[PDB]
């Protein structure tokens, strides 16, 4: 029976434990005999599975932590909306979106930092923003700072509601483990209610608010002259002027005469010629269809009334001759381990973020976002990074589940057991494929470099030489170009003009044009494959060998996160599944850096640019990519050296902040190498000398100073490495694109 059961007043709200750091952990509650205790406090703060053995307690803690996170996100959104309302040039941007740079942050004039308040436009000077909030609001139909103030108020109220809910559901009414372990009910409700009703409500908002307001805005009506959303709601005649099918009413809907709504529910495709974004009338139909699909999908599982499925039955029924027991035990694993669920959800969320980055650039969904090049580049790279981090976290939590919550007794001859039992084959084959891809993807660049440096330019892998044409990708692009009217008969235009078609230009600037793939694209795609495969190798090898290996037969006893097993066996450094995540995070950084560099160069060289009166488009770099992206020297010179000029010549301008952050990120990246190349013994001995110096003056801390643990040193090195590298790329990208766009 799916039912609600809670414990009333399980934990008393009191500050007693606020003054007892480490209370959650038995080893830490004692006190800080050394400085390692300080770091352990933070390292184990949110490891609820190591505080108690009670799945009920862990689930309640996770629920309340989720409520706190939602409150934080609502506060973040309210802050962005309030800044748009109060410290922004949103009205000027609405008046002239193609001339004034969006800005919603202003700095104070203290030490000359007022230089950062650049001339963005519209009689306003501030910090140019690249988050796309202006376009989000324009699509939503916001045309005033009053509406943004109300949005901020709603965000603040929701943040308060979320924090209150977290406190209430931890200290006043904490649901029980039976409540938590309702996968069927939790998926039915999420799918139908959350997703389906969310997209249904958004479809209603788009149909009643966004569509007419944006129709008038594209027609050129002034934002002050456009009527108000409630006016549109209550004046069916006014809305019937813009979309003449509202005079029909809901009778077509309830009689299945849905063609009557073709005026505002249309499968049009392409991009809005005026705004350069997707048709909001297409988005409304998209979201309505998604709402129907999700509400139907949310009626698949059994809750209380007999109708539905049981995921246990489905999984146990799905088994074959190559897999023995098949998916038996997975339902129990997933309703008894939070870490398995976290791994799955993180992997899917990260892959979704990557997919979102791709689709949000080839099909700009918001008005005037396509020609806002800083926004496009920033969003693409941001979501790529979030996706990579989420994937690495999925690997980490898969390893944590394997070490902690994996039970061979309950996993016998099922898929998990069989994977463990032939892990050697998987890792060996992935190793071979990684080496093969590395060779045949990077040795090609090395070959081109050597031939160009030897003057044998006819022996290179180039479009003007030996060719490596991505015929399959070109074939797919041709399919998508010809689909409108042939394989998608009732679609007027292609899904994206990147596949092929005509250039979409807004404000004498390219919004989206066909992206041509050649030898350089073939090479860079195969390098992407190489990097992804190596990252997967590291993460999967760690996860599979988390529990045991030929080297360390008892590794689960050591744990998920341990430094080593000593200098024996030749040396067992970094053998755990945590160190696998550490190295795989390095490799994810490599992969995503190459991906975002590819995007930046390709889009600046073959998509983005200004269209002349001739109809010809001159790109930001002008075809550099085809003949330069085939050599590492070409990447070093025509991309890094060439495009770093904007960030290194930013001093004295509003991008001087970008220049300073460029330098600081370089500093942090280098500073990471001190932790990454070094070991604990040297620093402990140096601390011994420093402690002697302190003792010579008859004083020294009661908390004995200690060098960072080995794992903590690796973590600090990795964190500083990632911060420095990503910050360098951040400053470089933002400075370059804001200078040339």
């Amino acid at each position: 029976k799916v039912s609600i059961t809670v414990d009333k007043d399980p934990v008393a709200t009191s500050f007693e434990k606020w003054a007892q750091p480490g209370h959650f952990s038995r080893t830490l509650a004692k006190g800080p005999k050394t400085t390692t205790w300080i770091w352990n406090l933070h390292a184990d703060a949110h490891d609820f599975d190591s505080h108690t053995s009670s799945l009920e307690d862990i689930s309640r803690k996770i629920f309340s932590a989720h409520f706190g996170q939602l409150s934080i996100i609502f506060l973040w959104l309210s802050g962005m909306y309030f800044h748009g309302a109060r410290f922004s040039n949103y009205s000027a941007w609405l008046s002239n979106p193609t001339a004034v740079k969006p800005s919603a942050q202003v700095v104070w004039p203290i030490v000359g930092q007022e230089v950062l308040n650049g001339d963005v436009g519209g009689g306003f000077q501030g910090v140019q923003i690249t988050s796309g909030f202006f376009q989000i609001w324009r699509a939503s139909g916001i045309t005033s700072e009053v509406e943004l103030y109300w949005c901020a108020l709603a965000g603040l109220l929701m943040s308060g509601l979320m924090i209150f809910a977290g406190w209430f559901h931890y200290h006043k009414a904490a649901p029980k483990l039976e409540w938590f372990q309702n996968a069927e009910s939790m998926l039915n409700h999420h799918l139908s209610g959350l997703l389906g009703l969310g997209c249904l409500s958004w479809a209603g908002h788009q149909i009643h608010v966004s569509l007419p307001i944006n129709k008038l805005l594209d027609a050129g009506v002034a934002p002050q002259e456009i009527p108000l959303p409630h006016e549109f709601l209550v004046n069916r005649d006014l809305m019937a002027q813009l979309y003449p099918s509202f005079s029909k009413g809901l009778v077509p809907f309830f009689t299945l005469n849905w063609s009557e709504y073709s005026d505002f529910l249309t499968f049009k495709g392409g991009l809005n010629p005026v705004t350069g974004g997707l048709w909001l009338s297409d988005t409304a139909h998209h979201h309505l269809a998604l709402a129907v699909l999700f509400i139907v999908a949310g009626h698949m599982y059994r809750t209380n009334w007999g109708i539905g499925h049981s995921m246990k039955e489905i999984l146990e029924a799905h088994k074959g001759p190559f897999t023995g027991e098949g998916h038996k035990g997975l339902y129990e694993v997933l309703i008894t381990s939070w870490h398995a669920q976290l791994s799955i959800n993180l992997a899917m969320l990260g892959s979704l973020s990557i997919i979102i980055a791709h689709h949000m650039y080839a099909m700009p969904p918001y008005p005037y976002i396509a020609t806002d090049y800083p926004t496009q580049l920033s969003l693409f790279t941001h979501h790529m990074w979030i996706g990579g981090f989420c994937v690495c976290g999925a690997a980490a939590h898969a390893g944590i589940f394997m070490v902690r919550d994996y039970n061979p007794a309950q996993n016998y001859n099922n898929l998990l057991d069989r994977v463990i039992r032939h892990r050697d084959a998987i890792i060996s084959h992935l190793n071979w494929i990684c080496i093969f891809l590395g060779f045949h993807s990077f040795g090609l660049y090395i070959h081109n470099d050597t031939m160009r440096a030897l003057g044998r330019t006819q022996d290179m892998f180039s479009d003007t030489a030996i060719q490596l044409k991505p015929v399959f990708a070109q074939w797919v692009q041709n399919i998508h170009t010809v689909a409108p009217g042939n394989t998608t008969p009732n679609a007027l235009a292609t899904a994206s003009y990147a596949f092929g078609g005509n250039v979409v230009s807004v404000g004498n600037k390219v919004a989206m044009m066909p992206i041509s793939l050649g030898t350089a694209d073939f090479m860079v795609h195969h390098i992407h494959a190489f990097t992804i495969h190596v990252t997967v190798l590291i993460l999967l090898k760690g996860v599979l060998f988390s529990r045991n290996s030929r080297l360390i037969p008892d590794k689960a006893n050591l744990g998920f996160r341990f430094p080593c097993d000593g200098p024996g066996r030749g040396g067992t450094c970094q053998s755990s599944a945590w160190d696998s995540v550490f190295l795989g995070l390095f490799w994810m950084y490599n992969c995503i850096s190459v991906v975002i560099f590819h995007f930046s160069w390709k889009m600046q060289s073959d998509v983005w640019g200004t269209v002349q009166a001739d109809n010809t488009v001159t790109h930001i770099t002008g075809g550099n990519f085809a003949q330069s992206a085939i050599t590492i020297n070409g990447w070093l010179r025509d991309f890094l050296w060439a495009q770093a000029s904007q960030v290194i010549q930013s001093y004295g301008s509003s991008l001087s902040a970008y220049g300073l952050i460029f330098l600081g990120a370089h500093f942090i990246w280098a500073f990471s190498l001190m932790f990454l190349f070094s070991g604990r013994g040297y620093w402990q001995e140096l601390i011994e000398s420093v402690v002697w110096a302190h003792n010579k003056l008859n004083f020294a801390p009661a908390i004995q100073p200690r060098a960072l643990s080995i794992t903590q040193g690796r973590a600090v090195g990795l964190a500083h490495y990632l911060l420095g590298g990503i910050g360098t790329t951040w400053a470089f990208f933002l400075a370059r694109i804001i200078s040339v766009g």
Binding site: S14, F15, K17, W18, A19, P21, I110, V111
Partner: protein, 42 residues
């Protein structure tokens, strides 16, 4: 005020944050009212 809440305010990170925010405010206001002081005036 609750003694436990006061101890929580006395904890090391809270005190460090408050003290360094106070110091940053001191320096910021000094530079706001007496800016561009590259030297001790003599």
């Amino acid at each position: 005020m609750d003694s436990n809440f006061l101890k929580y305010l006395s904890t090391a990170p809270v005190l460090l944050t408050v003290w360094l925010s106070f110091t940053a405010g001191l320096v910021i206001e000094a530079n706001r009212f007496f800016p561009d002081m590259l030297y001790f005036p003599m």
